[PDB]
């Protein structure tokens, strides 16, 4: 329909059907929605100056948020760090150039864990972002600002970054779609990143098709990023064709961890839905998958490190211990990086073996729904939040999180993982889940209505 009946609910595809008059109001209406909702959600670090809308590109006028570790003209890029509070790149990341050339309007920069080092957005130097479904709770992370902004309807879509789950996991916790493409499909030129072998930029959206559309836009060879491939992948063409006759694998490992009961229940229902649509679902055993998290935590940080009062006894001891731990960790990386890379190859091989016989691997995106801000102080617990998302980064595989109902009144995500360059199939499977979900209305997952 041609009229914008509720800006918060708008998808990219609905925007395309708006009359020109209604469409040219979108960037301003986004700014107004941010002004109303962001004092509660705290998704944004900065917003743009409201300016004339260009009617250039197919996707002209459509407002989007960009995670603030992605460099942008016009607005500062803080990486949610105090030291970069006033930093201006005067330069657009390749993915931002692409978005803007397609017509999208970057209305703001979204909050993140400082330097993208976290899983809940609480480590932002500025403030925590709050989950639109429950403002006491985390939106996940590190792309929490981006997921919260989409969920709350402040923007139509967003970009985040994903090293070990940081697009998929916040999308899961906020009840929106989060996509991480095959390694090599999206330029990291303009991403302020500490792990070259693991990161992709990915879209966060209100629908599965909207994520495929952004993938069509941001993907492609970039001479400024030598990791980008020349292979063209079609994300959208087959998206409606369903999953009848497909075969899906579920890792036994999922069942060997005590996850949130409602998350388990939602996941089993998704599996049953897939069987009703004419697919088969089988448990598989992936021998080295249990080493994924430990392997990730050698490689990702190894990469990062290679890119008057009668007081003070406590501080000095803590300092010495902290400096000591740092030097010891350096030793560990030296002793164990090569072995971690061998284990990474092995995990990757085993996943490719599974994906030679099955169309995709299915897991819950997260073992839990959104936890409270200030709730998780246990280090081991915190670092296990990416348990199910990490393997796709290790193996360079396409993976999507798609909402599938609720647990404890909070959104649950289901993850589809495909073989390298099978992004189109991943999107096709995800779309079948969304279209047929008993928790969606007309193939669309509910979006929360934050009180102004």
């Amino acid at each position: 329909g041609m009229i914008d009946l509720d800006f918060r609910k708008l998808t990219i595809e609905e925007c395309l059907k708006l009359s020109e008059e209604e469409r040219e109001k979108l960037p301003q209406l986004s700014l107004e929605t941010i002004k109303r909702l962001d004092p509660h959600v705290k998704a944004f670090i900065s917003v743009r100056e409201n300016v004339s809308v260009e009617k250039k590109g197919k996707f002209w006028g459509i407002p989007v948020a960009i995670k603030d570790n992605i460099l942008t003209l016009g607005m500062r890029t803080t990486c949610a760090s105090r030291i970069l509070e006033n930093y201006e790149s005067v330069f657009d990341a390749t993915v931002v150039k692409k978005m803007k050339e397609a017509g999208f309007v970057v209305v703001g920069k979204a909050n993140l864990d400082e330097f993208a080092m976290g899983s809940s957005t609480e480590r932002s130097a500025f403030f925590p972002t709050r989950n639109p479904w429950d403002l006491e709770r985390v939106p996940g992370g590190s792309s929490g600002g981006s997921a919260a902004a989409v969920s709350a309807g402040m923007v139509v879509a967003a970009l985040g970054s994903d090293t070990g789950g940081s697009v998929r996991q916040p999308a899961s916790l906020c009840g929106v779609v989060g996509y991480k493409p095959t390694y090599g499909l999206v330029s990291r030129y303009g991403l302020v990143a500490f792990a070259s072998s693991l990161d992709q930029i990915g879209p966060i959206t209100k629908t599965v098709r909207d994520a495929a559309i952004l993938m069509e836009i941001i993907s492609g060879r970039d001479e400024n990023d030598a990791t980008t491939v020349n292979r063209k992948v079609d994300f959208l063409s087959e998206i409606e064709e369903g999953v009848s006759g497909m075969k899906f694998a579920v890792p036994e490992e999922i069942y060997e961890h005590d996850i949130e009961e409602g998350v388990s229940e939602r996941f089993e229902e998704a599996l049953k839905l897939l069987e009703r649509l004419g697919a088969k679902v089988e448990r598989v055993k992936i021998p080295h998958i249990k080493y994924s998290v430990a392997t990730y935590y050698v490689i990702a940080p190894a990469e990062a490190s290679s890119n008057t009062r009668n007081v003070g006894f406590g501080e000095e001891v803590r300092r010495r211990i902290m400096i000591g731990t740092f030097t010891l960790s350096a030793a560990y990386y030296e002793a164990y990086f090569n072995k971690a890379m061998k284990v990474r190859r092995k995990i990757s091989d085993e996943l490719n073996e599974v994906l030679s016989q099955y169309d995709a691997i299915l897991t819950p995106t997260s073992p839990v729904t959104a936890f409270k801000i200030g709730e998780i102080k246990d280090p081991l617990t915190y670092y296990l939040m990416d348990i199910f998302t990490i393997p796709a980064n290790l193996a360079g595989l396409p993976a999507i999180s798609v909402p599938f109902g609720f647990s404890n009144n909070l959104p649950v995500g289901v993850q589809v993982i495909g073989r390298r360059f099978a992004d189109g199939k991943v999107f096709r499977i995800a779309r079948a889940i969304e279209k047929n979900s008993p928790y969606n209305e007309n193939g669309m997952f509910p979006l929360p209505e934050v009180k102004a």
Copy 2:
């Protein structure tokens, strides 16, 4: 003989034969020797006020150094930290009470790595200690000040502390005897320590018998340290009885690392000497011994943690990474402490299996001779300096380092490791090596003569 012919060369047993007049001069002569030599060696953090010599106790007048992580009346205990530069315990550690009751005179506090966290003494907050055999070089650590003071002859003997080699290794590098007793024989009450399951205080001496004598003094049950055992061990009685008919084990693992050639050569000669004295020497395979170092570095630190310019981007990034590494290490300890303890039990079991069939295990104390101050910056290299000493702490076993000639004009140490509470046998084996060494004169290893 009754005359002190050269203070630097004096042993505890020689002191006992001095005339009263010559003996009462020792504490003052120690202070004078420190004044002359310590500007070059830098072994001491503090020295005592020269006072009247009491003639009480069998060992009256005999000057000794105490590592500055051991609490002492009269003098400050800095732990080689700036924050404790002016700290006074007003309290003697149990081992210091024992020493003083026996008559020994504590003339000074010896330098160490700050809070005993190191293997070369270079991490002293105050200054590095320098090897008396070559002042460009490290004395080892963390008890480097104590070993250097004995070697240089500033004192007759000293006490250090040993968590993963920190008595044995500096003794090895300085060409003196270093002893680490069976776990449970020596009180840690008054040791400023971060690892309860691994640490013993031990003596550093000019002769093997002098170390047995100090063990007789400092050992014993202490109600202030519940880890101290009631079992009495005789260190001295059998010390002269030799090794004829004994059987010794050499771990195959020694040969699977590229160690300093001269260290290997000295070690093989010690093995041959033992066979000439009527013992047999056999290589053994200890399956899990290769996991010792990794296991140690989970447990010891786990324990420690449980006890205007347009500038600044670099510092903030380093800070974030350092804080990040610290939290991740905490997660690691949480995930892996119990497993490390299982591997520790296994290593300990295997060592006990070896020590049921062999009288002792023999290794080089160190894979290298003393390196240059400022030379070792590689973390992995640095943390491998205790490769051969760590296992005795893991298994709670008695172990001694005894000098056996030189490599690259620097002292080499040979290590004897015994079964729990077989300290007397360890001393007996070590004494046979010293007595018969082709590098000793009259059963005594040369001591370096630092130029005033």
